[PDB]
């Protein structure tokens, strides 16, 4: 019941649907009490001498009217409620996705992809279950149950009613108990099945090892047989599952038998008729489902409260540190100052501090060299403003980085990361990912500038060919070239390449770098390759080691002083 307090925005937004549904639902829960009592009245009239065909026609017509009303109203409340449930699922998928889109790497570094994708599947389904079936069981457990009870009391008998209803709460609490124990034992057997799946995956992936060392029919067969004998301990679940139906049958049959016997004793005492007794056995059949519904509502609302808390821990309990509160800037002429900037990710308590002091101007190609894990990508990640801003300042031609409009800023940067990730689309759509406008001749010029087009028209079935999700005709260098073409099609004021060239040898990549620097014509470009060939043509070069600028200057100064530059230039060739 607590979760319904949390979703007050959903019910307040859709008060009309749920109000109509609950109105029709209470109306039809009232109308279902009339057919059995009318049947009982018909029996009493038949036993009486005053029965006539007019009475037959009246009862038949009233049954048809009530039947059609119950069907129609049933359709409409089902449509309204469960449409509300599916609609809540739609709304929460929309909210979760809109949250994920407006959220930076930090949130994914904390929360793994598996947990977020689990929130989108199980938790939304649980929440939608509460807005639908949960409301329904709340209605059918309280209002339908009490309506059945009060009708059985007033319109039939109170002694019969209180006698016959004594086993039903025992059924309710027994169903809750067996449901709990089934959940425990099913969790245990599901853990065993997961162990079986893990062992079979280990055997399949390590099938070469299981064949190499002769354990084919010796050990893995024994492991799968023993773990299948452990998965055969779902009989512990069956021992509890097979008490679910017979307990119900026993208690319900006892209730029917109480109703029959006490009704047959009360008819002797002239406190009941036959038809009231028959109607009682009908209402007893109506009353069974609520006693299940109590336990199912308990499970449903608890799981939905858990799921909604889990959703709001991401949705409401997370906010991006990114707020261009007062943009008053315009496209800046590449005079980008990093006179001091320093930061870390959360991976240390300000211990492995990246600590940089640099400046660049439009056309200043800034090659960045160094060893693995040495801060090269980190500085451009700071330039990309993905993480919250470091100490010091980055400034674009006078304005700090924080005050720049975020959309415009991120649109200036054409960034090729180290992981050339594709979206499982066509190569043409992957290139137009950068410039999402309508296609024109610029895409052909752009992919021609990447130099992969000579291979693209022939080898990977032309442009219109699916790539990603294992694609077709894969290659790391081809993905790198497609990423570069995407970046070029963006047409950035500031190009950034992080190790894209490393896939293909320097012979073609150096010419590609030269053609890029020719085509850009003084636009800012950052190059970060482990190799130094592309870096050699950079008008500005820096070398980092441990997140610190070892040296900085032209290629000649590095070749003279920095031994690492000449040594790595010679080692590659």
């Amino acid at each position: 019941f607590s979760v319904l307090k949390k979703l007050g925005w959903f019910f307040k937004a859709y008060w009309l649907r749920y109000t109509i549904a609950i109105v029709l639902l209470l109306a039809v829960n009232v109308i279902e009490m009339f057919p059995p009592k009318l049947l009982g009245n018909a029996i009493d009239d038949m036993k009486a001498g005053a029965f006539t065909a007019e009475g037959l026609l009246f009862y038949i017509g009233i049954f048809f009217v009530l039947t059609a009303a119950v069907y129609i109203m049933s359709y409409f409340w089902m449509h309204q409620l469960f449409g509300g449930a599916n609609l809540m699922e739609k709304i929460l998928r929309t909210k979760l996705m809109g949250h994920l889109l407006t959220m930076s790497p930090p949130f994914y570094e904390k929360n793994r992809t598996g947990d977020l994708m689990a929130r989108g599947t199980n938790d939304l389904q649980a929440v939608s279950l509460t807005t639908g079936f949960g409301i329904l069981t709340l209605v059918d457990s309280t209002m339908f149950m009490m309506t059945i009870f009060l009708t059985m009391g007033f319109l039939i008998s109170w002694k019969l009613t209180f006698a016959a209803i004594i086993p039903l709460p025992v059924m309710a609490i027994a169903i809750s108990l067996y449901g709990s124990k089934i959940h425990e034992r099913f969790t245990e057997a599901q853990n065993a099945f997961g162990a079986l799946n893990d062992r079979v995956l280990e055997s399949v992936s390590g099938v070469r090892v299981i064949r190499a060392y002769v354990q084919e029919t010796n050990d893995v067969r024994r492991f799968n047989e023993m773990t299948a004998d452990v998965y055969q301990k779902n009989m512990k679940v069956a021992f509890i599952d097979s008490l679910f139906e017979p307990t119900v049958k026993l208690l319900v049959g006892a209730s029917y038998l109480i109703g029959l016997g006490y009704g047959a004793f009360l008819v002797f005492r002239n406190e009941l008729t036959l038809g009231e007794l028959v109607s009682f056995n009908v209402y007893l059949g109506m009353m069974i489902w609520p006693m299940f519904a109590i336990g199912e509502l308990i499970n449903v609302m608890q799981r939905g409260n858990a799921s909604l808390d889990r959703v709001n821990e991401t949705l409401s309990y997370e906010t991006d540190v990114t707020d261009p509160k007062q943009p008053a800037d315009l496209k800046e002429p590449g005079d980008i100052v990093f006179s001091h900037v320093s930061f870390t990710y959360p991976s240390s308590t300000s211990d492995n501090l990246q600590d940089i002091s640099f400046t660049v101007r439009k056309g200043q190609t800034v090659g960045i060299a160094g060893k693995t894990g040495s801060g090269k990508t980190t500085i451009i990640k700071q330039l990309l403003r993905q993480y919250p801003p470091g100490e010091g300042s980055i400034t674009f031609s006078g304005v700090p980085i924080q005050q720049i409009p975020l959309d415009r800023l991120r649109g200036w940067i054409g960034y090729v990361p180290q992981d050339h990730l594709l979206f499982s689309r066509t190569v043409k759509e992957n290139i137009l990912y950068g410039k999402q406008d309508a296609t024109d001749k610029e895409v052909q010029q752009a992919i021609a500038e990447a130099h992969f087009e000579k291979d693209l028209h022939m080898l990977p079935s032309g442009l219109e060919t699916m790539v990603g999700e294992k694609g077709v005709a894969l290659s790391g260098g081809q993905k790198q070239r497609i990423s570069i073409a995407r970046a070029l099609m963006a047409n950035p004021e500031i190009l950034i390449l992080d190790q894209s060239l490393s896939a293909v040898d320097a012979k073609t990549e150096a010419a590609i770098i030269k053609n890029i620097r020719e085509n850009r014509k003084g636009k800012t470009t950052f190059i970060l390759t482990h190799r130094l060939s592309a870096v050699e043509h950079a008008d500005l070069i820096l070398v980092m080691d441990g997140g610190v600028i070892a040296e900085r200057g032209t290629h000649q100064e590095l070749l003279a002083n920095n031994g690492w530059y000449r040594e790595q230039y010679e080692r590659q060739q």
């Binding site: 029996i43 006539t52 994914y108 399949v204 190499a212 028959v278 990912y433």
Partner: protein, 664 residues
Amino acid sequence: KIGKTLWRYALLYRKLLITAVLLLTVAVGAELTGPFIGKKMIDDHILGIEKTWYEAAEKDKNAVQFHGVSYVREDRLQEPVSKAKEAHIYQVGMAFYFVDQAVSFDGNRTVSDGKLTITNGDKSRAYAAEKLTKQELFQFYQPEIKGMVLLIALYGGLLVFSVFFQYGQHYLLQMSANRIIQKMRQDVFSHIQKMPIRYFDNLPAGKVVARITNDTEAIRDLYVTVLSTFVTSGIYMFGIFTALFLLDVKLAFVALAIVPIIWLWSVIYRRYASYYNQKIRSINSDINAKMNESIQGMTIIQAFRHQKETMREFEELNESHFYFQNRMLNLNSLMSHNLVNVIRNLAFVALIWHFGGASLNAAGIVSIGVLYAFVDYLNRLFQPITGIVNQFSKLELARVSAGRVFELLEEKNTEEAGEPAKERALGRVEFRDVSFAYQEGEEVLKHISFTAQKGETVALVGHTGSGKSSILNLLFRFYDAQKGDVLIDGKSIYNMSRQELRSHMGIVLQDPYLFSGTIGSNVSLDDERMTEEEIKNALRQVGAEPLLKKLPKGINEPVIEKGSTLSSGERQLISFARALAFDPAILILDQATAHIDTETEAVIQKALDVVKQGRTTFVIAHRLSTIRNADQILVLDKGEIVERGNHEELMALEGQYYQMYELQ
């Protein structure tokens, strides 16, 4: 076919299934007896007053007093007097009126001026009657109370026997299902172990594991469906219709109309819901795929600002999901439970109509008990209809999963054979005109032929790295008998059993998979013969490669992850340890390209200096140290042979060694 194989596995464990069906049948009979007992209790005892009564001397105990006059019931008579003051106790509304005189014929009873007038059509006839007090009616209802604590006892007694048998049948159907699935999982895994590497190399591990584990859970749900939903309810419905025909055949032939209805509704539900649920499942998979692609590629979206278009695509999928889900809601509303309630109310209509017609003329006197029994039985009949229909709709996916398993089971070209390990091989390996086309069109090996010496065979190198190399590990045993020949110690590789080939080989993969359990279990693989010898070899391992971590001070360290839990170097240590444990007779080490060449690799280099002490240690010499320390070297020209010689390749082709030095 699918159903043929399911029947094949179910005919096994036929005793449990037959036991279950028998217990079920008894439980069903017992459970359905109760309403027939209610029929008896209604028509005999509570409506016995409606039956004719006679007047006899108060000698029998059955006779009941009525204002000092003893009246005995016709059914309860012992034939002491016929037509001796025949009496009727007719019911006028809520008042049972005694009619001492022999009633001529029944009808529409009415009470006027303390006289009962019975009208039947045009004709009418009046009699004298006196309203009975509560006590008198109760006294007349007393000659039944004694016989009502047998019917009740029977209902109680046939309801506590059914309960135990119902538990028994559900448990036995379950047990039979899980045992059948146990046999199916064992058969599938044994057939997996017989099947070739090619099936694994075609599709990933996930489809294989899904066929072994997930699809067998689907088949478990299929068997439990068929048995607990279709078979159970079928027997239940059969017994119900049996009782209904024992009660009223004319009305039971109306009640049989529900069976064509169930046929029609289950057929329509299948036809539509298969489409809608297929589209919902497909679109949900598409949505989860979009979310995974986004989360993996969020940074790229933010860089290029594709979030608006991405959200547009997401909302397109989500709205199509909402449309199909709302359509399925419309179908389920019209045609799941609301229809059940309709059928129930229409059944009550048919009851009221039929028994009202009985209340016309003189066939409506003893029939109300049948009304109660029909009302009690039909609720039992209309309950499982929804379950039947929904499970019928859901059977198609289970048949798909089962067919996907029986495709695996029915596959041919199995590698079944014995494992002779009678003697240890010397390792004089050689090859003659060996050509193997794994892709049938593309030739991968072009007449390769080289004679390894009796030990000290260290001659292997890729085609300048990442060319045509690793397939030679596959050449010996995983793929065989294409063309050419390969011999070990002067005997053919193809004639021998494949397990005999594998009996003495030992291979370290590029990605050694660390098995679960203890590190001793990860090495020995729980070999039964090698229990204490595993510890004896662990002494050698700690002597050669000491435990720098030494977390539990033994061999009890459980392996947590699949690989590189502690360090990438320890993986290779465990692999070489496993190699030296089994047999140093023949062995092919990894290429070590993925490794970073840290200082820990030097320890692995020392392990190579141990591991090369064995016989015929093939090594893809990608590393510079492996190249220089090799006894012999054999670089391949795309499956052809460049030449042979550790220094001859250095002398002739200096570019190869220089390129490998530049790379490594």
